[model samples]
Target chain A: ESRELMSAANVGRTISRIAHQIIEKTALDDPVGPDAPRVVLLGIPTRGVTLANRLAGNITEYSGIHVGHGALDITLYRDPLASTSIPAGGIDDALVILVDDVLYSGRSVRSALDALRDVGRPRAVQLAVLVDRGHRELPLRADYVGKNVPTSRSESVHVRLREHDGRDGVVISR
Target chain B: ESRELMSAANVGRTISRIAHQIIEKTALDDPVGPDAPRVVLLGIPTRGVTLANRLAGNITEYSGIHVGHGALDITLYRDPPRPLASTSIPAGGIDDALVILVDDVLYSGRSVRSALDALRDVGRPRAVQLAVLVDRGHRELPLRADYVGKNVPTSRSESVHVRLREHDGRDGVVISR
Candidate 1:
């Protein structure tokens, strides 16, 4: 693959933990449980996006109810073009959970905010990042962080996946 | 109440008939059925306003299911401009709910399509069905009403003097010429 960024074991554990966080945060409307006002996931090019699928899997596996899934590409959404759209359905009243890989300057998450408007108005949108490498470029934060790596301003974090990369692990480079 | 085109008894009969038809069409999608989708009645602009609310009352009374009710004002969407204020729709945006687009008179079938354009900005519905009181056909588009109360073919002359208390005054569709 590309390079060793994570072991398959680390991949599984992180996903499992993030999945629980997603359930706890988004399911606030589930006083009756599982299937009230539903939850939808907008997956940003979650590189090796089985990350989002895996997050959804455990969400269902724990609660016995499945959630909505839609794709939102952040590339053009970041390029100042309105490219965000969840075509499968409207997210107006649903609690939206955006999933992605690494959290650095928080610019990518901000771009996701830009994209959410192209689809439809949602009740609320919460962020979930697999890795939160500390840096303050934009005033953005993740509601769910699987691993928080405190990196300096000059450092950049690389999250390589097992599927495309040689293995899965987190890389910090300056 | 103001110059009643329909007698009190006639309005009741018309309401009863439309309610029965609505129940019959949507009752197939009962909560008793697992995949049964909910029905929502949205009255088209200007007229047919409380037409939805009235039908909602009778439908709930007959079908034992509390249906959704809302309004659609296609004034901005149309050729000539009308008031932009009447489009105040109800809450619980129409997601996956079977939408029954209602109107007082299905004359040109143009507003029906135009209303759909506005609805696209909102949540997508699982389905759409046209329900109307009168189908005075001179339609430029190929449209038909799914549930119709009266097919009053006018002289292609006048759909005039129509009033509903909210828009004009009173509750039922009273057409004058």
Candidate 2:
């Protein structure tokens, strides 16, 4: 059996809250002031990219801080010529945050971290995830977490976004 | 001329974030787990009640924690005692529980003080915290909010309106002369 964890509106709220938290964490609260901390959000495609864009939109709307976001394809790191599409001015000495849908084993994030090394050097890298299922094989943590869902290893989480799944919701099935 | 301080979506998002923060503050994260800390949300009418309801909705939806919320009629306690509004407290009562007073805007801080007086007449809460959508500078009392959505600086001549979808037919925060 499957149950709905978050509805479309709930998901939107969670993401918006995370966006606001990000702004506060990076000290980008003033709408009329200039952005002092150079922030770059690199999402692990495909749904991660959509979430990154949504977060960027909220950050811009709430704080007037025009943030830069791009997709980091982890699949390409195995073997690819075009592995990443970084924002203008690059991520050098910038606060780079990696975005993902679900954080379970933390292997995908570790791979993204490795992929990031090949791209450009960042001042620091933080993690943000929509849901944390909690079965971490690696010692990694999310700096900004939308929701902390406690689930058994047998169950699987499915995050659906409107851009890809025609709807926005989070469901867990066994 | 006036400008929109916050859009409908922005207001919704801000409320949602505040709801989540409340849940976190109460340490109510698990959906199936029984509620440990007794939390009560008392909103000073009229728009405060609507905001309280919305916060309750989000808290339940996100954390699966069923919270108690009601409307607090501060008009009387402020001393008809204004237009006679109703005070609806939850069945659980508020004694020994953490009570969160919700409001739309915080300006002079007199309204919140009146709410504190009203709540005292109801029941003695373990603790009380304040939450507001907008915190406009100009405090007559030494009062500060526990959770503030936006900190807006306003002149004495300007007016701020918090329009909710349920009560005002639309959700927005506007400032005008």
Candidate 3:
């Protein structure tokens, strides 16, 4: 049902184009080549894990660097809470490329930072987002942005992927 | 709000009753003064942490034994998953006690065994629970039980709990762990 709507809405084509564009933009900064730098794809849990896996798969396929991947749940690391209701496992020490589905208020990103501090210190921390819907509440920007969709406060952009929401596309809903 | 619903649920009262029963049982067994066999509470995270804390508070208030409390996350020690998704933090070491392993359930007893293995190097406890809020009857090991809150004679599928303040959103026991 949603697929038909997405097809009619030209959402599939848009996402496909965006995926290709992400590849293009990432290729331009192909730091990990034949003797490429070691890159660790760290996904923010719940949604970012899937996106990070996808990006890692794509990066390995394109650049042949065989990057490492891990998932991080920053729920407890947020300023409001220092500990989680669930036990978050130990973090791996590696060069981290933090992946998220969207970059908005940057509060979540800041929470991720807090979480990273509790874990082992990394060599470097880079930001990668599928969507950079600009309306910055924090002085934060992505190092690698797949797409930048401008929107107002009243609107919310939802990125649904087949791996998670059982669909692939971005939806603007009130 | 859920807070009112939780109060209405009367879980807190139930746990208090259980706490009283535990104290009673311990007293009956030892029947000695304040320095009877020592008792320490070890809670498994997320729910057990709170239950252990509450039990420790109660024991301290009643017996005046400066009861110790600690939290253990058994994710790394889980049996099914041979190796964890990532490396885990070192399990906290606990000194001697009648080290009571406080948990909500006692099923296969695999988790308790794992915890025991993890605690092997920590220190020797005088005794340990196999103390649960509920014992929904199904034992795969040769382990005898002790210090039970309530035994519902439940099937393998059912569960139970003693949801104290320190973990779950409310204060009380539940059928679910």
Q: What is the interface RMSD of each candidate, in Å?
A: 22.4, 6.7, 24.5
Span of 10 residues, lowest total lDDT, candidate 1 chain A: A78-87
How well is each residue in A1-174 modelled by candidate 3, as lDDT tens digits? 111223313444443444455456434355456323345666787667777777766666655545567776787655331222111333344446677888986667756755665666554456778788875433345766666777777777777777768767777766
- Per-residue C-alpha lDDT of model 3 across residues B1-177, encoded as one tens digit per residue: 012222424555555666666677556335566645455567666666667777767666666655566765667776454533222222443443456666776665556655665555466554455466665655432233456655666554545554555555556544532
C-alpha root-mean-square deviation, candidate 3: 21.5
Residue B80, model 1: Cα distance from true site in angstroms? 7.6
Clashing pairs in 3: A33-A36, B11-B172
Docking class of 2: incorrect
Please say which candidate is ahead in DockQ: 2 or 3.
2
Question: Model 3 segments beyond 4 Å from truth?
Answer: A1-174, B1-10, B24-37, B63-65, B80-96, B159-163, B172-177
Model 3, residue A128: distance off in Å is 60
How good is the docking of model 3, by CAPRI class? incorrect
**lDDT digits (tens) for residues B1-177 of candidate 2:** 799888776787778779878865565653323645588999889899999999999888766678899988887666322546789999989998899999999999999999989899889998999999999989999999988888999999999999988989999999999
What digit string (tens of lDDT, one per residue) describes model 1 on residues B63-153?
A: 6667778887777776544656466555777877778888877876667756765665666776667777677765533345777766665
Poorest lDDT segment (10 consecutive residues) of candidate 2 chain A: A28-37
Predicted complex 2: DockQ: 0.08
lDDT of each: 0.67, 0.85, 0.58
